[PDB]
Enzyme design. Structure first.
Site, PDB file in Angstrom:
ATOM      1  N   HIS A 144       1.121  -1.051  -0.144  1.00  0.00           N
ATOM      2  CA  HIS A 144      -0.335  -0.328  -0.106  1.00  0.00           C
ATOM      3  C   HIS A 144       0.752   1.185  -0.267  1.00  0.00           C
ATOM      4  CE1 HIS A 144      -3.479  -2.106   2.000  1.00  0.00           C
ATOM      5  NE2 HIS A 144      -3.077  -2.235   1.068  1.00  0.00           N
ATOM      6  N   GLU A 185       1.393   4.184   3.041  1.00  0.00           N
ATOM      7  CA  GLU A 185       2.554   3.216   4.303  1.00  0.00           C
ATOM      8  C   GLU A 185       3.691   3.307   4.354  1.00  0.00           C
ATOM      9  OE1 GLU A 185      -0.043  -0.037   4.418  1.00  0.00           O
ATOM     10  OE2 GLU A 185      -1.414   0.814   4.266  1.00  0.00           O
ATOM     11  N   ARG A 245      -2.898   4.325  -2.677  1.00  0.00           N
ATOM     12  CA  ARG A 245      -2.830   3.455  -1.870  1.00  0.00           C
ATOM     13  C   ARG A 245      -2.981   2.270  -2.649  1.00  0.00           C
ATOM     14  NH1 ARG A 245      -6.549  -0.293   0.727  1.00  0.00           N
ATOM     15  NH2 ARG A 245      -5.551  -0.814   2.454  1.00  0.00           N
ATOM     16  N   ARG A 264      -5.597  -7.317  -1.306  1.00  0.00           N
ATOM     17  CA  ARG A 264      -7.694  -7.864  -1.664  1.00  0.00           C
ATOM     18  C   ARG A 264      -7.070  -8.176  -2.854  1.00  0.00           C
ATOM     19  NH1 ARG A 264      -8.409  -4.038   1.873  1.00  0.00           N
ATOM     20  NH2 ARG A 264     -10.414  -4.235   3.512  1.00  0.00           N
ATOM     21  N   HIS A 270       2.248  -3.317   6.654  1.00  0.00           N
ATOM     22  CA  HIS A 270       1.867  -1.934   6.276  1.00  0.00           C
ATOM     23  C   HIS A 270       1.754  -1.295   8.022  1.00  0.00           C
ATOM     24  CE1 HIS A 270      -0.678  -4.677   3.481  1.00  0.00           C
ATOM     25  NE2 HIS A 270       0.271  -5.723   3.776  1.00  0.00           N
ATOM     26  N   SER A 271       1.687  -0.073   7.372  1.00  0.00           N
ATOM     27  CA  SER A 271       1.123   1.452   8.553  1.00  0.00           C
ATOM     28  C   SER A 271      -0.237   1.763   9.273  1.00  0.00           C
ATOM     29  CB  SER A 271       2.037   2.177   7.873  1.00  0.00           C
ATOM     30  OG  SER A 271       1.118   3.043   7.670  1.00  0.00           O
ATOM     31  N   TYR A 316     -11.500  -6.864  11.466  1.00  0.00           N
ATOM     32  CA  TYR A 316     -12.553  -6.676  10.307  1.00  0.00           C
ATOM     33  C   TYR A 316     -12.569  -7.993   9.591  1.00  0.00           C
ATOM     34  CZ  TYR A 316     -10.130  -3.377   7.579  1.00  0.00           C
ATOM     35  OH  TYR A 316      -9.248  -2.777   6.365  1.00  0.00           O
ATOM     36  N   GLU A 333       0.855  -4.116  11.042  1.00  0.00           N
ATOM     37  CA  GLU A 333       0.102  -2.354  10.826  1.00  0.00           C
ATOM     38  C   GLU A 333       1.495  -1.863  11.804  1.00  0.00           C
ATOM     39  OE1 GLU A 333      -1.696  -2.006   8.938  1.00  0.00           O
ATOM     40  OE2 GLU A 333      -2.906  -3.129   7.910  1.00  0.00           O
TER      41      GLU A 333
HETATM   42  O1  BHK Z   1      -2.861  -2.260   5.731  1.00  0.00           O
HETATM   43  C1  BHK Z   1      -4.608  -1.798   6.283  1.00  0.00           C
HETATM   44  C2  BHK Z   1      -4.941  -0.348   6.522  1.00  0.00           C
HETATM   45  O2  BHK Z   1      -4.270   0.603   6.230  1.00  0.00           O
HETATM   46  C3  BHK Z   1      -5.217  -3.075   6.504  1.00  0.00           C
HETATM   47  C4  BHK Z   1      -5.258  -3.767   5.033  1.00  0.00           C
HETATM   48  C5  BHK Z   1      -6.349  -5.056   6.092  1.00  0.00           C
HETATM   49  C6  BHK Z   1      -6.581  -6.005   5.244  1.00  0.00           C
HETATM   50  C7  BHK Z   1      -5.777  -7.602   5.519  1.00  0.00           C
HETATM   51  C8  BHK Z   1      -6.392  -9.091   4.367  1.00  0.00           C
HETATM   52  C9  BHK Z   1      -6.858  -8.249   3.174  1.00  0.00           C
HETATM   53  C10 BHK Z   1      -6.773  -7.179   2.909  1.00  0.00           C
HETATM   54  C11 BHK Z   1      -6.963  -6.119   3.871  1.00  0.00           C
HETATM   55  C12 BHK Z   1      -6.217  -3.398   4.046  1.00  0.00           C
HETATM   56  O3  BHK Z   1      -7.185  -2.998   4.900  1.00  0.00           O
HETATM   57  O4  BHK Z   1      -6.138  -3.023   3.322  1.00  0.00           O
HETATM   58 ZN    ZN Z   2      -1.458  -1.593   4.371  1.00  0.00          ZN
END
Ligand code: BHK
Ligand code: ZN
Ligand code: BHK
Ligand code: BHK
Ligand code: ZN
Ligand code: ZN
Lengths: 307, 307, 307
Positions: free
Chosen positions: A69, A72, A127, A145, A196-197, A248, A270
């Site tokens: 992303h 981040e 992102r 995703r 990630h951040s 989530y 994160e």
């Molecule tokens: O890095 C993140 C938001 O800053 C958390 C990740 C959590 C995630 C994890 C696995 C699959 C999709 C999303 C997101 O929502 O894209």
């Molecule tokens: Zn991320």
């Protein structure tokens, strides 16, 4: 910086500066680090992975990807620091030296280079990737995703304009497919860590399903130990647990895919800040964030070498 | 290839073949084309500029340089096509004829001959010059970061091993100094176009500073018209704007230098492909790329002869 | 006068005299001071900034602008005294010496030269720039309402004839854009101080919004310390606080823009007199005003250099 010793680790850098950093490190530590190109981004930029190895033939390995992303920034900055730290501690720290003497580490500092370039050029908070497709004005896919693990299920968006758009199909993004191909071809990865951040969490497998992984007891304890290690430095508090129960439901995620390939020690970090600065984490926190995060990652690696 | 009428414009060529092409053209069009040597490369190779003129006393001129970055093969190939096109259209096309009746065109097909030879013999993706820096196991400078325009500032590397190394000092590279001396000596250039490859962009002055040029409105209008003309042929989409706002800060650039010399119509084209093939653009796209790019360049020339 | 040592600091000067003063100072202290032209005013006059530096590369800097509102003569006169003061105290006062050994100071004595010339030639009370508006018989813009910080919002006028007209768009005035580009390109400014006249106030960020800045507690205390130092010389009482809570809501201000760029120590000074003489402050108050104001400024610089 004409040397990794003149490189400013306390400031954020551009794609060019990080790619240059890579060659400097390899030049300075040829018997330990090498630069591998695992593919080309949507916009044709080389995708680089730094391989840390002391020899052997396809020794058990640890995968660490950062910056999937683009916005981040603390992650790419931490990845650069990680790279330098590996070269400083090998032959200095008994534990890390032991790890590298028996295992290889593959580090991808900028997993989404097109988006990274874009965060520097047009939009600091971008992102997704920068892929363009079919009939849709909007651009980019949420590369985290887009993996083939519950792809397209609840926890992702099917709208090309969504910030969490999962893409047309699993592995549609070359940035993701390049990693999938490398890891599958390698066949001997024991750990897969995605950095990630912000939110300060250490999560383990399955964001796409409420099903509990067979290794929940062990990964949960490894996470607990990793968070305690990370915290011991500056008191930064992290929460931990499975993705779906902690934040989530999220589908098409990297660690759900890696865990399902049989890579047991799959975790996603994160990093720093719980919202004070969010994605715009001050450069003054780069080194402290990298240092503490390293303790958590090393903790995981240690459990990987003896298990 | 005994004639420019038998030269294969649909394939990539070597330095020797392009240099031989220049003589064929001059011999075939003596009253219009002449070959000027503006200097010698670091490795001693002659640096050639084809001059297209119909007479006059150092009339207002248009400068066009291609191949400053050796691996961007689509540019040298487009440069050859341009040379041939000029000789075919003068006297026939009303607009181009009018341009050459009051202005001269100076075309440098291979601005970095040493790098070009290197892309054919050792490394297809080499981009810098081939100068030896005395204190470095690395070779070459990014010739388009070596100009005296924000030289040494952010947007370039001070490391001799970097792919974007700016060099020891402004104009250190003879490939650059040769152009600088030529243009300064001439003193009557109205347009300065630098041709590069891939990303499909038409950019105007300042990559080294966020300062918008005094002629921003006009150059932006010219760029807009140029991109529409280019797009009218095959639908190829180009984005346009200042270097820094469109891409990112970049110092030591050629058009930043030319513009600061009082050459108002300074633009840089980043030719075909948005990343599918990148620098390895298929030969089958040479002619179509040259054709469409020509429409854009012509558009700029027209705004120069009338304004 | 051929020396800054015979320069009359106790009298008001013309644009030419100040510009000549700059050259004298540079000629006398070449190792410490240099004159930079950061742009050209609407009427083409050079816009100069005096750089004070003891070396280094892009060292953390302190920005000081005066005279953005032409009629506030006490500010430009204070700027001249400031310039001389720096050359006298470096190497004499431990604190100031320490600041210059690690930081650079950029001083713009006449930020609005066209208006300044106008206050000397046609209207002593003119405060805006001298830009000509397309469909209007009125001239100029309130340069301190033209910055890109809440531009066009409550606290400024959209009417060209108004004394507080904000202009066509943020940064429309070259006098403002010149500073913006310089500061942005520099990227390492730690303090940004704007000097204005009468009301005897020291204000910190946000005149356009009631939103409290993240560094409110620190800036407020720095302000308190600065006013105490200033008062300690002649007993001059200053009030401090945020712009909006101290004076009134005002948009497009310089320190709101600078603070939003990440420059923490952003303050605006409203110099001597609370209304007795107003803008027509007697020349006999120039030196005393400059002296006391310096103590306040030095105080801020000390907080900027330490931590
Ligand atoms: O890095 C993140 C938001 O800053 C958390 C990740 C959590 C995630 C994890 C696995 C699959 C999709 C999303 C997101 O929502 O894209
Ligand atoms: Zn991320
Ligand atoms: O040709 C290019 C890469 O293929 C884009 C150019 C963009 C550029 C343009 C002007 C000055 C510096 C850089 C580059 O970065 O060297
Ligand atoms: O110097 C001043 C008048 O003498 C006060 C400033 C207050 C101000 C501060 C920030 C933005 C706009 C205005 C002004 O109104 O122009
Ligand atoms: Zn190029
Ligand atoms: Zn004022």
């Amino acid at each position: 910086a004409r040397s990794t010793n003149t490189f400013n680790y306390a400031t954020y850098h551009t794609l060019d500066e990080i790619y240059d950093f890579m060659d400097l490190l390899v030049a300075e530590h040829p018997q330990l680090v090498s630069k591998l190109q695992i593919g080309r981004s949507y916009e044709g930029r080389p995708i680089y992975v730094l391989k840390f190895s002391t020899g052997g033939s396809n020794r058990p390995a640890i995968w660490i990807d950062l910056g999937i992303h683009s916005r981040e920034w603390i992650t790419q900055a931490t990845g650069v620091w990680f790279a330098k730290k590996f070269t400083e501690d090998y032959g200095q720290d008994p534990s890390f030296t032991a790890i590298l003497d028996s295992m290889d580490i593959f580090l991808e500092i900028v997993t989404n280079p097109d988006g990274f370039a874009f965060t520097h050029s047009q939009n600091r908070l971008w992102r997704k990737t920068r892929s363009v497709t079919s009939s849709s004005l909007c651009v980019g896919v949420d590369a985290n995703r887009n993996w083939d693990a519950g792809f397209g299920k609840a926890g992702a968006s099917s709208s090309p304009c969504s910030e969490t758009y999962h893409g047309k199909y699993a592995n549609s993004e070359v940035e993701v497919k390049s990693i999938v191909d490398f890891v599958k071809d390698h066949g001997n990865f024991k750990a897969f860590l995605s950095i990630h951040s912000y939110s300060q969490l250490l999560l383990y497998p399955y964001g796409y399903t409420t099903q509990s992984i067979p290794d929940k007891t062990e990964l949960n304890q490894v996470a607990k130990s990793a968070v305690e290690a990370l915290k011991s430095l500056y008191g930064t508090s992290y929460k931990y647990g499975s993705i779906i129960t902690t934040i989530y439901q999220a589908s098409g995620g990297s660690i759900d895919w890696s865990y399902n390939q049989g890579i047991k020690y799959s975790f996603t970090f994160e990093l720093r800040d719980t919202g004070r600065y969010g994605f715009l984490l001050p450069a003054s926190q780069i080194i402290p964030t990298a240092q503490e995060t390293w303790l958590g990652v090393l903790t995981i690696m240690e459990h990987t070498v003896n298990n």
